[PDB]
Design a binder for this molecule. Structure first.
Ligand SMILES: *[C@@H]1O[C@H](CO)[C@@H](O[C@@H]2O[C@H](CO)[C@@H](O)[C@H](O)[C@H]2NC(C)=O)[C@H](O)[C@H]1NC(C)=O
Ligand SMILES: *[C@@H]1O[C@H](CO)[C@@H](O[C@@H]2O[C@H](CO)[C@@H](O)[C@H](O)[C@H]2NC(C)=O)[C@H](O)[C@H]1NC(C)=O
Ligand SMILES: *[C@@H]1O[C@H](CO)[C@@H](O[C@@H]2O[C@H](CO)[C@@H](O)[C@H](O)[C@H]2NC(C)=O)[C@H](O)[C@H]1NC(C)=O
Ligand SMILES: *[C@@H]1O[C@H](CO)[C@@H](O[C@@H]2O[C@H](CO)[C@@H](O)[C@H](O)[C@H]2NC(C)=O)[C@H](O)[C@H]1NC(C)=O
Ligand SMILES: *[C@@H]1O[C@H](CO)[C@@H](O[C@@H]2O[C@H](CO)[C@@H](O)[C@H](O)[C@H]2NC(C)=O)[C@H](O)[C@H]1NC(C)=O
Ligand SMILES: *[C@@H]1O[C@H](CO)[C@@H](O[C@@H]2O[C@H](CO)[C@@H](O)[C@H](O)[C@H]2NC(C)=O)[C@H](O)[C@H]1NC(C)=O
Ligand SMILES: *[C@@H]1O[C@H](CO)[C@@H](O[C@@H]2O[C@H](CO)[C@@H](O)[C@H](O)[C@H]2NC(C)=O)[C@H](O)[C@H]1NC(C)=O
Ligand SMILES: *[C@@H]1O[C@H](CO)[C@@H](O[C@@H]2O[C@H](CO)[C@@H](O)[C@H](O)[C@H]2NC(C)=O)[C@H](O)[C@H]1NC(C)=O
Ligand SMILES: *[C@@H]1O[C@H](CO)[C@@H](O[C@@H]2O[C@H](CO)[C@@H](O)[C@H](O)[C@H]2NC(C)=O)[C@H](O)[C@H]1NC(C)=O
Ligand SMILES: *[C@@H]1O[C@H](CO)[C@@H](O)[C@H](O)[C@H]1NC(C)=O
Ligand SMILES: *[C@@H]1O[C@H](CO)[C@@H](O)[C@H](O)[C@H]1NC(C)=O
Ligand SMILES: *[C@@H]1O[C@H](CO)[C@@H](O)[C@H](O)[C@H]1NC(C)=O
Lengths: 424, 163, 197, 49
């Protein structure tokens, strides 16, 4: 019987809170398929091959061939539109500075490699390495080099300019200040980022290296893109395999029917072969349309992630990785995009005794931005997502009402900054 | 059948007469008179795509032979195939008519070019400088979204049989 | 500009025209007219010819219904997206980037269109940016000062604090900065006075 | 009918296509339930009081 997970009874009580005292910069991978293989089918050559009489008989069926070609053409243009929507979200090709120092933060694994002819990142190169009769396969409109160039432009914009380039002109900002802005976005004060800048940079570099190792060491990491390739190839193979089906006729070869039977029965046999092959082609086109709808939905989701995780900081829970989202990095992949979501995960939490308000001078004080915590004997106010105890003053609390209404109010002193100034 | 009979490098066993590929199509054969192996390469099929502007504007066309080398058919070789009737220009413009593999076509005669992704911008990044906006633009943009389609009803009996 | 709605109208009209055109197909029978088949053959073979026509026309009609259902799924997804945009861009202000126009989203206006909706997204775009010298913190009296809501900028000689999305320099005071720690930890801290009201 | 199956074998891999599509739908439903409900890897429990 499958195990849902490990049991974890949370120690809930009416006056205790758990405050994180540390954090982990976690980078996670999200793989999204964007496009499929663009396939075109020659209806006359698939159904009839080279038989002129078969083509003459095929003309009696009307616009079935036109319908199948039009549907495949629609899917083919749809794939290019999907790639254009996901990757071509910037009209300026941004470039990184030559001195690639960003405050201790290392982006070598995601920036393009000058040594490689393909101008791809080490992660992108790993991703490309790990993904492997009337019918034609059309090349994509955007080549791998151009998609890689678009990802490079997006990476340069999100590294040198933060989220400003996605909402207008690219405004340069130092990367630690950008990371402090992102820390403020998830509700952590910038001082936490500045004081721990080296530790955060080291954690980010370690996580990026772990991401490369994890992708290199797991065969089933990139299954989602591989399935798309497999689904396209298997469908194509099945369609060709349908040519080797008699469909209830004496032979699957038209020439055998012409040579072995008279025209009154020959027309019936070719009609059976034509209807069977046409039904096979219609089945293939229907499967392609359903898969195209699925891939279009996935591409729309990928475009939404590109806009909301890479070009800005998202407050949506679990949209851009597990944890509080800080930033995201796009990487090109065969028929897809891989998002490296950099998130803030709280860690090393500690119990504290908590109260809703502090009673001082017959007045109730509430935290302006934090929470009241007690280590056992003394009361402090700290930010909710990191343990940074500060003295309860009139500058970080606000007064609303007396102490008689709030349930669970505790008695503690509230310091006044102005008191030593007039006292001295 | 119909095909091009070329010399074959496939070593048949002495009992085999016909040959099949992955897709179960007859691609190798052994001549009855001569015990040599001949490949039956199918006649050089290609998809003919026509690149044209509106007939209101001009009647000039270009022809793309998909997956056909240019020596086997204003001639340009693309990864999509051979494009005849369009002249390659080393300049990059926006994509007007998509050809494929980074190639796009436009009318100005018909020209073919590698499409530009965007204008090149270098961000002046430094570790102690910031750029702050001093003004703003109130921009109104349009987004068109389809909501519904035409509601269609079909009389099945009348369509199939009439009267 | 209005290609998407006209495209939907074109697909529906084209599908109906193709479905009408498919009646002109023999489907492997002697004629495409049913009355001719009755008027010309005995029921044992006329039944077979009428069958050939019926299976061809029924296949055409099922094909049309299949593409109608696929297009219905596509239009339903687009309509769900349009309802989401109407709820989040028109009935509120969205923090989602590029969901409600290019730029920082302010508000949106709905307009009816044939088989569709047109959203006029009113957004705020920054412009006329200017370079400034910036610092993570200000060192004063052995204490590190960080902006409460803005960013420290310098025009060359003087240090100010301004909001991030518009240039409005203000004097660095204790009212708009907060103190955390000394000046020995923050990398890139500069020395400047902090005014006390 | 064994003769019907013998005649049905002449039509090729239609049956395999239908079974593969149904198998894809069947695994898709389980994936849908797994995505919606199994969003936590820890089974949390409420306090007795
Ligand atoms: C906060 O305190 C509670 C209890 O006061 C701790 O919960 C206990 O944790 C231990 C260690 O796993 C368990 O064996 C007990 O069964 C738990 N008790 C209850 C009532 O749940 C909790 O671990 C403390 N939090 C931290 C971060 O130390
Ligand atoms: C917060 O966590 C980090 C790691 O997540 C701690 O950094 C480690 O500190 C130990 C000893 O102090 C070193 O041996 C490790 O090499 C450090 N790891 C990294 C990645 O730098 C850090 O000390 C923790 N801080 C607090 C206050 O608990
Ligand atoms: C950024 O990260 C890269 C890769 O993690 C570092 O390159 C490594 O440098 C060491 C010493 O120079 C070599 O032993 C490794 O083989 C390198 N790895 C790779 C993949 O090339 C690089 O030094 C880091 N720092 C900077 C400033 O780029
Ligand atoms: C709760 O925290 C406060 C401040 O961090 C502690 O108060 C200090 O404790 C140290 C330890 O002996 C003393 O040397 C200081 O003089 C104390 N400061 C003041 C202002 O009294 C307090 O002890 C902590 N309480 C517990 C139970 O850990
Ligand atoms: C917090 O302080 C208030 C007043 O300073 C305390 O309220 C008094 O409680 C005693 C006995 O419970 C009564 O006799 C007084 O009349 C109360 N005075 C007022 C003004 O209400 C309150 O008990 C204190 N709370 C704690 C937990 O010590
Ligand atoms: C901020 O300063 C930088 C460098 O002092 C400016 O960047 C230069 O702009 C000129 C004019 O377009 C270019 O010719 C240089 O190539 C740019 N240098 C770099 C390194 O990119 C930047 O334009 C200034 N910002 C503003 C708003 O004036
Ligand atoms: C900010 O930009 C607006 C325009 O976007 C400027 O307004 C223009 O001001 C000039 C001279 O005052 C007028 O001739 C124009 O007609 C104004 N344009 C509009 C649309 O009203 C404004 O002056 C700019 N402000 C700053 C401080 O540069
Ligand atoms: C930076 O800005 C400050 C104020 O915004 C400038 O200080 C004033 O400069 C004007 C003219 O230069 C003087 O008349 C004022 O007396 C100055 N005020 C003070 C308080 O000193 C400063 O000059 C600017 N620096 C640069 C390099 O432009
Ligand atoms: C900013 O001011 C601090 C002190 O107010 C300077 O720190 C002193 O620097 C001198 C020479 O560099 C040292 O001998 C002292 O020991 C330092 N004192 C302390 C407490 O650090 C600091 O150098 C100044 N920074 C700048 C850029 O002017
Ligand atoms: C919290 O719970 C304890 C026992 O469960 C109780 O004695 C106390 O009054 C409660 N306090 C509040 C504020 O509910
Ligand atoms: C068949 O005819 C060819 C024609 O020249 C001849 O060379 C060959 O020896 C004959 N016999 C066999 C077994 O191929
Ligand atoms: C910025 O870079 C220069 C040289 O690259 C260095 O001297 C300076 O200390 C750096 N400042 C910060 C805040 O990193």
């Amino acid at each position: 019987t499958m195990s849902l997970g490990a049991e974890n009874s949370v120690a809930y009580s009416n006056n205790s809170i758990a405050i994180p005292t540390n954090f982990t910069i976690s980078v996670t991978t999200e793989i999204l398929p964007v496009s499929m293989t663009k396939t075109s089918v020659d209806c006359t050559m698939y159904i009839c091959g080279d038989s002129t009489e078969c083509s003459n008989l095929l003309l009696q069926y009307g616009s079935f061939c036109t319908q199948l070609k039009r549907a495949l053409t629609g899917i083919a243009v749809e794939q290019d539109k999907n790639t254009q929507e996901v990757f071509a979200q910037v009209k300026q090709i941004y470039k990184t500075p030559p001195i690639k120092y960003f405050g201790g933060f290392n982006f070598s694994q995601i920036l393009p490699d000058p040594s490689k002819p393909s101008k791809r990142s080490p992660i992108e190169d790993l991703l490309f390495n790990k993904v492997t009769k009337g019918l034609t396969v059309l090349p994509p409109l955007l080549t791998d080099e151009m998609i890689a160039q678009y990802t490079s432009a997006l990476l340069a914009g999100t590294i040198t300019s933060g989220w400003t380039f996605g909402a207008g002109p690219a405004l340069q900002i130092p990367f630690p200040m950008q990371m402090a802005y992102r820390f403020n976005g998830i509700g952590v004060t910038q001082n936490v980022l500045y004081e721990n800048q080296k530790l955060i940079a080291n954690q980010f570099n370690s996580a990026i290296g772990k991401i490369q190792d994890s992708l290199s060491s797991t065969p089933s990491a990139l299954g989602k893109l591989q399935d798309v390739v497999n689904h396209n190839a298997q469908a194509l193979n099945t369609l060709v395999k349908q040519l080797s089906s008699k469909f209830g006729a004496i032979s699957s070869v038209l020439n055998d029917i012409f040579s072995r039977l008279d025209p009154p029965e020959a027309e019936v046999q070719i009609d059976r072969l034509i209807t069977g092959r046409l039904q096979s082609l219609q089945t293939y086109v229907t499967q392609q349309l359903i898969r195209a709808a699925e891939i279009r939905a996935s591409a729309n989701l990928a475009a939404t992630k590109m806009s909301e995780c890479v070009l800005g900081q998202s407050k949506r829970v679990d949209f851009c990785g597990k944890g509080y989202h800080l930033m995201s990095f796009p990487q090109s992949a065969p028929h897809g995009v891989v998002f490296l979501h950099v998130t803030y995960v709280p860690a090393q939490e500690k119990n504290f005794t908590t109260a809703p308000a502090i009673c001082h001078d017959g007045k109730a004080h509430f935290p302006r931005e934090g929470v009241f915590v007690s280590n056992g004997t003394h009361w402090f106010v700290t930010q909710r997502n990191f343990y940074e105890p500060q003295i309860i003053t009139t500058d970080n609390t606000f007064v609303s009402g007396n102490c008689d209404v709030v349930i669970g109010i505790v008695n503690n002193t509230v310091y006044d900054p102005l008191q030593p100034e007039l006292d001295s | 059948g119909t095909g091009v009979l070329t010399e074959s490098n496939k070593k048949f066993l002495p009992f085999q007469q016909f040959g099949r590929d992955i897709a179960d199509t007859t691609d190798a054969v052994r001549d009855p008179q001569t015990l040599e192996i001949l490949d039956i390469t199918p006649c050089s099929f290609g998809g003919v795509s026509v690149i044209t502007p509106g007939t209101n504007t001009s009647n000039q066309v270009a022809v793309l032979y998909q997956g056909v080398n240019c020596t086997e058919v204003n001639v340009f070789q693309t990864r999509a195939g051979c494009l005849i009737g369009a002249e390659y220009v080393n300049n990059s413009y926006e994509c007007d008519i998509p050809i494929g593999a980074g190639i796009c076509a436009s009318y100005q005669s018909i020209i073919a070019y590698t499409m530009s992704l965007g204008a090149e911008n270098s961000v002046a990044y430094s570790n102690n400088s910031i750029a702050i906006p001093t003004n703003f633009t109130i921009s109104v943009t349009t987004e068109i979204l389809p909501v519904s389609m035409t509601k269609t009803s079909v009389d099945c009996t009348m369509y199939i049989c009439g009267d």
